[PDB]
Swiss-Prot record, chains A, B:
Belongs to the autoinducer-regulated transcriptional regulatory protein family. Keywords: Activator, DNA-binding, Quorum sensing, Transcription, Transcription regulation. LasR in strain PA103 is not active, this is probably due to the change in position 180 of the sequence. One of its GO terms (biological process) is regulation of DNA-templated transcription. GO terms for cellular component: protein-DNA complex. One of its GO terms (molecular function) is sequence-specific DNA binding. This is Transcriptional activator protein LasR. Transcriptional activator of elastase structural gene (LasB). Binds to the PAI autoinducer. The keyword DNA-binding applies.
Length: 163, 163
């Protein structure tokens, strides 16, 4: 958090957050944030290293309104693990297949709810060999991730919306 | 949390939360919560085992508007540890003397910000023979309490405000 706060500009903050994620064992991350009373998902503040073509398609196709992790974030402060049980409807299943082709198979999303009403998500994806190991690994680092998401929120909200 | 969610009503929920905090080494706790855009601190939803005479005095004297932990919660998602340095104004020093006489010297407050705009605090106080010891006790459980505060928020917001 101290490095994140000493950092200047989005490239540096993004680089620090991405390295924190990678050092913890997660090769892909997304931090997304909106100001209070905005549902403008396609124009959120977005940081991270999701493949660019996936990000562009996701926004163009309005996947924020289909992706079950986003609806979850609007309702909860608790993590959502990317298990098959969350990809229930045909459209969510098709979304899962496309996300999988983009390299996003195993992971979790931590909802973000800031002190000024900011709404966001911190997602991390892990390239584990199988689902069981992905889950054992994520559980083992979950307390660290839980702290990380609040530090990223407090710092990122300042970068996204403060002058 | 499943424990928190399976419970019936406020007395049971309070007992579960208090036991979880006690297991982490905290003998005094306060969980306070307000619905979106209400700062009526004297009418918050309050759970825990602060001395009743302190709670009554605190509300009567309007200490929510003096206590630096409360203003911190309105501004941040990060913990505030209790220590002389957070008490900066003359009024805050007077508050600190009274809080200390009530036994509330070593501890911390975790701000709560829920998905529906709920604003709250989970405060946790530890008994210790000195500050160095209090710090060892708190640091050793910080990642676990960081999860706990969000489970308590998600369950407590429903209990407090929803039919
Ligand atoms: C809660 C609203 C935040 C602002 C909008 C963020 C949009 C992007 C969110 C996102 O990509 C969630 C996520 O990581 N989804 C995973 C699930 C599997 O494939 C993904 O892309
Ligand atoms: C953020 C608003 C929550 C709703 C109002 C809660 C009122 C009580 C808050 C409180 O007691 C904070 C706290 O634990 N203060 C400590 C600090 C030392 O002595 C205290 O009483």
């Amino acid at each position: 958090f101290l490095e994140l706060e000493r950092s200047s500009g989005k490239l540096e903050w993004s680089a620090i957050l991405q390295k924190m994620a990678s050092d913890l064992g997660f090769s892909k991350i997304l931090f997304g944030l909106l100001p209070k009373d905005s549902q403008d998902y396609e124009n959120a503040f977005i940081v991270g290293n999701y493949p660019a073509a996936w990000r562009e398609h996701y926004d163009r196709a309005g996947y924020a309104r289909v992706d079950p992790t986003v609806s979850h974030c609007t309702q909860s402060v608790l993590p959502i693990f990317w298990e098959p049980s969350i990809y229930q409807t045909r459209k969510q299943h098709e979304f899962f297949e496309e996300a999988s082709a983009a390299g996003l198979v195993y992971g979790l999303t931590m909802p973000l709810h800031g002190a000024r009403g900011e709404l966001g998500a911190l997602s991390l994806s892990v390239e584990a060999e199988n689902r069981a190991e992905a889950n054992r690994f994520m559980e083992s680092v979950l307390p660290t991730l839980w702290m990380l998401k609040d530090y990223a929120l407090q710092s990122g909200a300042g970068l996204a919306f403060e002058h």
